[PDB]
């Protein structure tokens, strides 16, 4: 991300986040299993005005 | 448990004056017939519940169910042709 936007320029920010479902990559608590023909599952993303 | 003076000794009491004798008996206080008034309600409203709690709470839990289970299309190894 830029550290000073001046008076007519433009940003270009990134950002990455991880969803964590399970909890490592070894100890799977917390995972779901998705295997399924359909399922009642989203993932719901607000973002900012 | 005195001892006897033998030179000064004393004999019983005498009369004195008297507190009227009838002064000293009382009367014997005469009780009437009484009750509890009211007509009794049969239960109260009362502040606090009158059976036990419970110290710890317990999780508790209910069963659910997976979904139809599909086929899958698996990597595949290769033969054992003496390599392997």
């Given at each position: 991300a830029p550290a000073?936007?001046?008076?007519?320029?433009?940003?270009?920010?990134?950002?990455?986040?991880?969803?964590?479902?399970?909890?490592?990559?070894?100890?799977?608590?917390?995972?779901?299993?998705?295997?399924v023909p359909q399922s009642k599952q989203r993932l719901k993303l607000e973002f900012a005005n | 448990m005195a001892l006897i003076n033998p030179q000064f000794p004393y004999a019983g009491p005498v009369?004195?004056?008297?507190?009227?004798?009838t002064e000293t008996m009382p009367l014997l206080?005469?009780?009437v017939e009484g009750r509890i008034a009211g007509i009794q309600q049969a239960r109260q409203?009362?502040?606090?519940?009158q059976g036990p709690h419970r110290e710890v709470a317990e999780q508790t839990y209910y069963a659910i169910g997976?979904?139809?289970?599909?086929?899958?299309?698996?990597?595949?190894?290769?033969?054992?042709?003496?390599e392997g």
């Open positions: 000073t936007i001046a008076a007519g320029a433009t940003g270009e920010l990134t950002m990455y986040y991880w969803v964590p479902l399970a909890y490592s990559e070894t100890d799977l608590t917390g995972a779901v299993l998705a295997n | 009369p004195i004056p008297g507190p009227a004798p206080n005469y009780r409203f009362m502040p606090f519940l997976t979904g139809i289970q599909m086929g899958q299309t698996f990597n595949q190894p290769l033969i054992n042709t003496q």
